[PDB]
C-alpha cells in the first residue's frame, strides 16, 4: 500500500527524478497528513464574473 511521489527539487547537490514514500497507518482519512498535491484554478469567477465574455483587445463597452 505504499504511495510514491516526486519531489520538486530546488537546490541540487553536485550529485533524474527524486522521490519520497508515504504509507497511511490509520483507517480514518482525518488522521492522514496533508498531501500538498494541490490544484490551481482560473480566477475568472472573481475577476471576470460578467455574463458576456470579455475580449481584452476590444472596447469593454459597446
Amino acid at each position: 500500500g505504499a504511495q510514491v511521489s516526486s519531489q520538486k527539487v530546488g537546490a541540487h547537490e553536485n550529485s533524474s527524478t527524486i522521490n519520497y514514500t508515504t504509507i497511511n497507518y490509520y483507517r480514518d482519512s482525518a488522521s492522514n497528513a496533508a498531501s500538498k498535491q494541490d490544484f490551481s484554478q482560473d480566477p475568472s469567477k472573481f475577476t471576470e464574473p460578467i455574463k458576456d465574455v470579455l475580449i481584452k483587445t476590444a472596447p469593454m463597452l459597446n
Binding site: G1, A2, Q3, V4, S5, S6, Q37
Partner: peptide, 5 residues
C-alpha cells in the same frame, strides 16, 4: 504494492 505517482 507500490502506488507510484
Amino acid at each position: 504494492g507500490s502506488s507510484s505517482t
